[PDB]
Design a protein around this ligand. Structure first.
Ligand code: GDP
Ligand code: C8G
Ligand code: CA
Ligand code: CA
Length: 167
């Protein structure tokens, strides 16, 4: 059985932990300590083939050590998560993608752009802007709500399809 390392990145407060914990444990967390970085292991059937997902929900400071880079370089695919009511988190997507390109030494790294908090009515990032950014990067785009579970499975499944295509 194939195994994949998936990494969830994006600014503080976008919903990285809530997304991950909905996927793994099927409940919505309101307050999860932002320093906790943990990994979860979940067997999933995607397009009729089972894979073991090893999912890292990131934490940390804005700093870049050799050993941190070497750990992040183990990820096989990355979720680039922003929140649809947080423009700064959308602008930050570029930075996260560039770090991952830098550590992976590659521009073709499996990635999915995720626009979270889709339940909220006060959107500041237009859907078209996000679709246009994902088009430019050559990656899929998925809107999610960790609150309602809308799109959660599909975001991680879509990332596994992208790793499968790349391998
Ligand atoms: N309304 C709404 N709030 C969310 C959603 N996802 C996360 N949140 C909330 O946003 C805050 C930050 O979420 P968290 O998962 O801790 O974000 P992280 O800092 O990216 O790990 C928490 O209060 C969450 O309950 C979502 O889809 N909708
Ligand atoms: C509010 C806390 C939170 O949710 N986060 C801070 C923000 N991240 C955490 C992970 N980060 C690092 O570990 C920085 N180092 C790093 C990142 C990346 Cl993407 C790569 Cl490819 C290499 C290295 O060394 C960044 C900020 C999320
Ligand atoms: Ca978190
Ligand atoms: Ca591509």
């Amino acid at each position: 059985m194939t195994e994949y390392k998936l990494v969830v990145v994006g600014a503080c407060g976008v919903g990285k932990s809530a997304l991950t914990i909905q996927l793994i444990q099927n409940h919505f967390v309101d307050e999860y300590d932002p320093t906790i970085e943990d990994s979860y292991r979940k067997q999933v059937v995607i397009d009729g083939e089972t894979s073991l997902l090893d999912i890292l929900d990131t934490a940390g400071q804005e700093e870049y050590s050799a050993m941190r880079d070497q750990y992040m370089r183990t990820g096989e695919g990355f979720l680039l998560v922003f929140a649809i009511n947080n423009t700064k988190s959308f602008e930050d997507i570029h930075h996260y993608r560039e770090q991952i390109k830098r550590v992976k030494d590659s521009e073709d790294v499996p990635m999915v752009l995720v626009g979270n908090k889709s339940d909220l009515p006060s959107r500041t990032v237009d859907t078209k802007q996000a679709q246009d950014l994902a088009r430019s990067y050559g990656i899929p785009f998925i809107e999610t709500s960790a609150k309602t579970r809308q799109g959660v499975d599909d975001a991680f499944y879509t990332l596994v399809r992208e790793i499968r295509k790349h391998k």
